[model samples]
Target chain A: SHMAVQIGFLLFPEVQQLDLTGPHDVLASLPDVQVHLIWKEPGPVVASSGLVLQATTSFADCPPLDVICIPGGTGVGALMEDPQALAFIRQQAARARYVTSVCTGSLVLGAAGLLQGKRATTHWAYHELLAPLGAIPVHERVVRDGNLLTGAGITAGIDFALTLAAELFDAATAQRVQLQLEYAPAPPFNAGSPDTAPASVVQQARQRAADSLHKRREITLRAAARLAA
Target chain B: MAVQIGFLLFPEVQQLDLTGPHDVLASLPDVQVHLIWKEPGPVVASSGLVLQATTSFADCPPLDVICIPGGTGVGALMEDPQALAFIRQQAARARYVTSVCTGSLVLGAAGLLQGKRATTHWAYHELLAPLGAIPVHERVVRDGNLLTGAGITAGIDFALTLAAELFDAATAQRVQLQLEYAPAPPFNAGSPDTAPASVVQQARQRAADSLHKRREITLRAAARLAA
Candidate 1:
């Protein structure tokens, strides 16, 4: 029996566009798959990088998705305490075959009470924040626990989606998609992870993200309290 | 001085071509980047992804760097006089003229790539010759102020290279580190030269329809250029 897999990516304002686009490129290549960009309302949303994307489906009209992906940016902090967003994720996670995220998106899943006792991962900068939401954080490119898959910052979405593709179809199918994307990367730097990045560069990145990180911490704590209550 | 960078946003474009470079370039501290289209509206990409245009062609200011991305829809654009004229006008004064993937064909359509060493997507590499461009099969090719990238994912490399040119190598390296762009792709099939014969055969077969259409349009555009 052949079944069409439905994949939905939650869209929001100020998202890191690559976090979604990188994965969307891989996942949409799968055969018999439908990819939907969903939001509370169907409209235009801009990414943190200033690239604008249109949301195709509203929350009320969204169908049951087999796979739900959440991407991260400063915008995700707002979703952590958003009752409507949290409720939607909670509802979807109950029946979705896989609940997944990329970058700091795992925190949003954590806020929805979906990451308790789950081994997950997030952007290296916010990796420690997962503990407050009861998720055991792992430092890796992609981490999977049960049906929950999480990827690290930005480009890691490609790896995460390719891994998910292998799980959804077969390794051979995934390999073909990888080749189609020309996934052979030749980066001019060696600073994707904290271990490889210079301390000065890491410090600058931390400082640049300080405001958003602070806001995220406060909101995550509040979300955790609400979950506890 | 704060430089202005503009990227051409069009219908049915491959979203990765724009997003990959946007992420890399926007990480730079002092440049104003704008996504421009003929009309200020949302358009669905080739992959069914939608992106909105913030600047309309009429309202856009002169830019230092003008970039055109490529996708399945680029074929129709090769025949579009308005797009070609706009690119020609911008390329005349812009500090750098650039393209990613098959976007080089559009540059050729605009009469900006004649006798230049350029590169494009593997499937359409040979097609560049008809437009008077010397096709170089490299990840990124820079002939003077004209820069071209090969294929969809190569935009990232193109951006990093452009960043180095705009600033110093140190500044580009800092931006690369900021984006965590140490790319370690899990697979080995990024290029036609590197992919297995079976995989390349399948890819060529899949791209046949789009390439056939592109060839027809390119020929028509080249004839128009010759006239």
Candidate 2:
């Protein structure tokens, strides 16, 4: 039997719960894979959606993982410069078979010096912020360059994890997991991408996210400067 | 002013049942969502994922929409008087009554599905007949003020529909875009009807234990209903 593969998801306050849960569902279904929600301290962490998740392992006690994923939300803004989280990601990325992220989580990976010159993606609203961190931003839903796989926005986690599942196991196994979860999506709208959405709708979305986007821009610039130093 | 919505959280829940919809619903502006359980504590889902409850049944405010999510633990909830009573109380006056996956069974246990058209997880579809719910094999079924979604992942569609109903299609579309909910599943094996025969058989085999126990519990609950 193949050795059990361990996957760790970095858990933090105000993370998008869907970012972690969507990927966890796919990864956990793989054979002999153990999924761990890890944090500096093991306890309950509230997501941006107000959903609270509990971290199963502390960073200090975490096992070296086969895959390490970081999910994004309001919480990720603070983590760009958080030494403990960056160090943990850097150390894990060095040994991990794959280093990945969903949504704006790629920014955190960028802050860890993992995305320099790599083609990546994040939430569409803040994609431009990737340039300062030396990452080449792409518009695809899921982008993979070597060991770095980044997904765009929230729902892309499902797609991104399925791709990773194929890499870790096989296409058949990934298809099986997709079937099990009933991944047939029936979205009642056509506004998932900036190009597809009406100009008015995109403008409204931008307005709504403007405040948070501004805050994230400030943090990303600061983090990038530190990287340059 | 915003409308308040509450979703039931219980032990061993299939997290996607709650999360898929939570993300969709949260994308709606001027709406407050609460994850409510019997007590204020952390409950581990069937997937080993842990989510903490924000409100208890005793402390919950009246909600406009009451959602019950389903999972492996739902079979046990069919026998839980406290859960049934809580669902009954909330559903009585809520503008809409809703369930995802096997959560419909819990709603039936609360006597909300009797003489109503409903849908549930494929493996448990036939069990709805025992509860006097006319089982409809559809993705999302809305019968009167009650809305039900079939199987685990169908919660996304349910929430999208609920969002459209709450406001306008444009508003729902805006929220859908905000969440980037354009779904492009890589596989064509989502439903029992669509999956390959071998995959369906494998699924049934894997669910045998839980289904057997669920069948037994459903019979008992039906008898309790009859009595």
Candidate 3:
């Protein structure tokens, strides 16, 4: 179907870049597609690293989406735990044809009870934490369990959206979008992932990320417990 | 010196890959930075995604840094001798040459990376080797005169690292704190190896088809460099 697909992306403070931009670029490339960078409010949201994004809609004002994508970053834990945001994802996901997350976005969905018994993927460093939410953590860049699609860390969203584009449209349409955007990549280092990176690089990233991880784990676990009550 | 950094603007380019780094480069206190395109007009990124640029490349000052970003127009830019030469000439005199994503491919094609080590968006690493570059895989690759960054989202790392190199770790850290540079990616699935087999296969397949146009662009840029 060449029907116009309205894709809604959530924006919040400290959101990850690849999570949002990856899918935004891919979905925006589709012909006749209306992509809305939606936030709870209509204003600019500063992503991680100060990449400011102007919103296309407020939650109350957004057009009904055929696809609703919630990207993950530092904000997700708080957003996921936020009563309003969780309610929003739950209500929206129930109605949307497809609901998806990238990186820690799955945790948000899980927090919303959207991932109960579902297979999902997120940032490589956090999969071990998924089981407590009753989610089967899948190690994939893009996982499509039922209508929910999730992607790995930042860059994977590009791949995830392209895959969704293929599934939603076809290989031809996805290919067209890829070519139109010159989707080819050339990363500078072999250290984007733990397995591919040097021991030193991995150690640095882990050390750098450990504190945040501990904090988030505690926050998310508490949120999950509250939801259970 | 109050150096000018001219960033080439066009339709369908990765706005963030360019703009993410732009936010950092432009914030360099003393540097005069502007976005440039053909004829002083607005350049719509891919699929009519639009941004209004301030000046034309023709009016740009002799630059200290000349940035050429990539997108669907890369192939088109490669075909446009005027655009390619503008980049070549500007980059030749620039004290620092920087690119993000496939933008490095443009630099490589412009003969900027002939003997330099560079990097680009990971999906296109192989293409860089043919352009006479020793492609290094990292979020940021700095080889004396040239600096390059990885795929679209890697721009932040590029910016932070560039800030440290150009100024000092203190400056970069200050900026990082202001930007809240700490990242918490929610998934473990960010790369080829980390991602599940299916994801890798699908991504590899998707990239296989997308490379045709980029290949043509790279080839043209190589020819232009030779001329």
Candidate 4:
């Protein structure tokens, strides 16, 4: 009960930079928690948006973790194909206190076979995609089924971290982090959800994401078939 | 016009203050984002998240927009000759001068806020006065070319507002939709105006040491300006 909480995030190419940074910023504020960005190796990893992040710990050097999180991105296609990555996640998830993800990262979790019969969520465009991976998808921003926690879309990482923060510590401590970061968000537009956005905007967004979504769908189906076999 | 936007990357910057806007604006079509720092190397933020700085101050191009982001790193910048000189040089012709969180203090320290209406993290809002800025209670405040955001999470809102001004409402809307910017927080404890008094008190206690240091830094910076 007195040891430092070890939390790690899987870092890879094309990962949505915000998906990882948002949550890391929140959870690192917890008392005596050490956060690590783990990759196949240590070096600068470029995100989908061209921002570069340095991975602090390599998969080979990773220690036992309290929480293991995967972030969403276009890179999931290649990530799911890497047996080494999946094996690492499986090995860690077996002992981690919480197995979690943000955005399309849930698919990566699914690929690792960690979501069987688990309640989870992902980016709205890929929410339905969770079903084939053996997850009962929830539409809420943050979904937690036992120790399995997940958040929807990219910015939802912020909310997801706070929810986990409350459980890991207490609501008051989580609220303190909230106030410090001033999490009262006031978006300039109400275009976050399919329900509130203009029809044309939604259509364009879907079209814009078509390439990534199509790739994600094919990969998810393949992974599901593997699990069944 | 192709907008060249530069964000000053300093050590110990609150990761969210910069990352939030960096991600939000990176989605904008046909814009260049550069992280400016003293050296072209990796910068470790307040949260221990490391980001590579793309350019050094001397090599950085003339930016159409220049933004200063905040964190524990700011107090040192308030008195640094290099940081102050760089901001003054770039701000002279930039289309927009912006900041998020306590970043407004860096602008204020550089003597850019002599009479400008500005804002910063609520914890540091009152300190704006010592640096000659008129403190406004708002999430985002803009006075002329100076645009400042309140606290950490204000980066997304601040960046979107800047996007609309730089391009158009349509472009900003398009970016917003793609990023899915609808925000729903689990707790309503972000601001003193909205948080429970007990939570706010706890936050105050947590911030006491840093607050005391910031006030002292502001006073020292203030006297330098007065002199």
Candidate 5:
């Protein structure tokens, strides 16, 4: 079968894990689906944790995408602020059947004004940040307010992908994929989000992520202002 | 210190295991990484999963850490003299050598793990003996210079431990948390031991051919290399 669906992954330095991997696993598994890893340039990009990813194509050379996905991370701040990045995304968003982001990735889309008046979600810790971008922030793992489906923090991308797969490919196909991947939940701990996590663990995790969060918040604010202007 | 990581991306691959770890590892910082392939162009994974990689074995620079991730492609690669030679050469030089799933089988066939205790994806463990290696049925096993992780999902544990060993506990902890390494799988069915017998049987049935082919290749390759 000819490749009917093209999925472009925004592969920037320091992007989130499940943000990219979760969705990629589902979407790429679809029959006749084409997946491309798009970066600002060619060559290897250093991830936030020192992992290396080789880009399939640069923004300038990537094939047009049916869907464009942005993953959240420290890179979100840079992507949100860079005019070139914003312009490229805006160009893709206009043609893309679905424009989505995971975790803080919503902030990046919001910076491009793609999320205006759209209900979205992000990492629980940064949900409120969406409001300033004229986005209706929803507290959910997967929020599909339209073709713009945004997911909550890291882990949510998997659920979001599964849900989106069901919507796009029908329940049976999605179920088969779920069954094949053994997509069942078995957590060692009770909480993945702030609301569900133990207070002490949440506090420690928040404290640890505080600096990165602060930086991202500031970047989002600047991006919001630019979008407003 | 910059982390030097190498990934072997080849054709006819089962992407999840390799891509899963690649996704996690590429998220770390100050890392020098490359995907070493035979010809270095776009390598299609099994069932036409496409990934455009850079550099070939002939072009790759020195690697500090090397990961040999397995897929159905291992059956073919294990039999290719050039491929085995390249892997043997790289593993010999790498500071740390790692494998995910049955990729350890490839390492074993490369004659790199001769007389070394290693582990591989559980389904393929029995064949390890043909390559002169002892296979341990563990999620992640480390013995001296060789580190091998069990089936697909085990790569995460393998990578985390690698991070801990190569860098510091604090750095590993930070990477783990950043990855939200606290996994909450909607289902607890990743392994044969944990999964229902039916599911395990189904998986075994589905993967039997590739597994058999891999064993044959490993045996032949090991025998050839020994000579």
Candidate 6:
């Protein structure tokens, strides 16, 4: 039997827009699929990159989502402790066929207590941080643990969605969309992973994100503590 | 210098063509990015994503770089006199004239690429020749002040190159590392020449009508340029 696939991307303030848009672009290409940018309320949500996307559905008004995706950015800190947001994720995760996150969005899933003992991944810089949230962090592009699918870093969102598409539909469907969007990636630099970049460049990357990283770690600890209690 | 970069936010424009470059360009320090339309408002992209334009053509400030992003909407846009005129006006002085995917077609329609080298999404690359542009097979092609990127994902590479040209190599690399732009595509089917025979055939078959419509509109646009 065929059913329309409902894909909901959790949107909030300061999300890295690529993490959301990359996957949104890939998955929305599938046959019989509907995409939604969901937030606590419906309105213009400004990404950390300053790109403004319209939020189409609120948490209360959202339909039954077949797949729920969370895109991470500097703003996930608030969602880590926001009871309403976590509760929303918990409610959706209870019924959704697939649970997913891109980049640091996996941390948000961890905050919701969805990653307990589950293999997951996130942005390269933040890969180790996953363990604090009770997730077994693996350094990979996309990791699938049962129905829980997680993507690594920002650009990895595209890879994650393509895999999810293959699972939900088939490899043929995924390959078509891959070819459709011109998914061949040719990067000018080898700085994406800690293994590839120069030591200095990697240091700069870490130093530049010092504040955000610090905040992320602190908030994750607090969330884990609360979950423990 | 505080450079201003503007992207033509046309109706039904492909979101990634615009967003990918915007993400890369905006990540660079010290540049004001504006999305300009005839009138600024919320518009739905071809793939059903909604993005808001931040500036109107008449109200926009002088820009250093003006980029047009391509999508399924370009065929209809080829007939828009106001949009074409705006492109001409901006191209007259914009330090760098650029586009991603079919966005280059609009640039050609404005009579900007008469004898220049350019590139576009493989499906529509041939359309550039009729518009008086020399089609290149590369992902990103630069001819003098004109820069064009190929297909959807090339937007990222195009913008990063533009960033390096605008600032210095060091500056562009800074943004690259921050974005973690090491790309690992899941499949090798992005280009027709590289994709499996069946995959390419199915895509071509599914898009036969769209390809025809784009070619028709391109000829009409070229005719206008000649006149």
Best by lDDT: 4
Model 2: CAPRI class = medium
How do the residues A1-229 of candidate 4 rate in per-residue lDDT, one tens digit apiece?
Answer: 3588999999999999999999999998899998989998999999998999999988999999999999988888888767899999999999999999999899999988988899998888888789999999888888999999999888899999999999899989999999999999988777778888888878888888888778878989998887788
* Cα RMSD of predicted structure 3: 7.8
Error of 2 at B221 (Å): 1.8
- For residues A107-218, what per-residue lDDT tens digits would candidate 3 score against the true structure? 8887888877888887777777777677888876678888988887655676788888877787656655554443444332334566655565556556767988898888
Clashing pairs in 1: none
TM-score of each: 0.94, 0.94, 0.65, 0.98, 0.73, 0.97
- Each model's C-alpha lDDT? 0.85, 0.88, 0.71, 0.90, 0.73, 0.87
Stretches of candidate 3 off by over 4 Å are A1-3, A184-188, B1-44, B47-65, B70-93, B98-227
- Can you write out model 5's per-residue Cα lDDT over B1-227, one digit (the tens) per residue? 67778888888766666766676566566876777887777777664446656678888887888898877777777777787788778777788988887788778777877787887766777878888887676667788978887765566677777877776655655555545544444344556556666656666776688677776777687778679
How would you encode candidate 2's per-residue C-alpha lDDT over B12-81 as one tens digit per residue? 8999899989988987879999889988888888878888888899999998999999998898899999
| Residue lDDT tens for model 5, A1-229 | 4667888888898875457766776777677887778887877665665445566788899877888999887778878878888888999988898898888889989999988899998877777789888898887667887789987777667667767776667755555455455444333233445555556666777887788778877877888878777
Ranking 4 against 6 by DockQ, winner: 4
TM-score of 4: 0.98
- Which of 5 and 6 is the better model by lDDT? 6
For model 4, the interface Cα RMSD in angstroms equals 1.0
Chain A TM-scores, candidates in order = 0.97, 0.97, 0.93, 0.97, 0.94, 0.97
Off by over 4 Å in 1: A1-3
Interface Cα RMSD of candidate 3:
8.6
In the range A87-128, model 1's lDDT, one tens digit per residue, is 899988899999999988999999999999999988888887
Error of 1 at B155 (Å): 1.1
Model 1 Cα RMSD, 1 decimal = 2.1
**Clash count per candidate:** 0, 0, 30, 0, 16, 0
Model 6: lDDT equals 0.87
- Sorted on DockQ, best first, the list reads 4, 6, 2, 1, 5, 3
- Model 4 chain B, poorest ten-residue lDDT window? B174-183
Give the CAPRI class of candidate 5: incorrect
* Fraction of native contacts (fnat) of each candidate: 0.52, 0.66, 0.03, 0.77, 0.09, 0.66
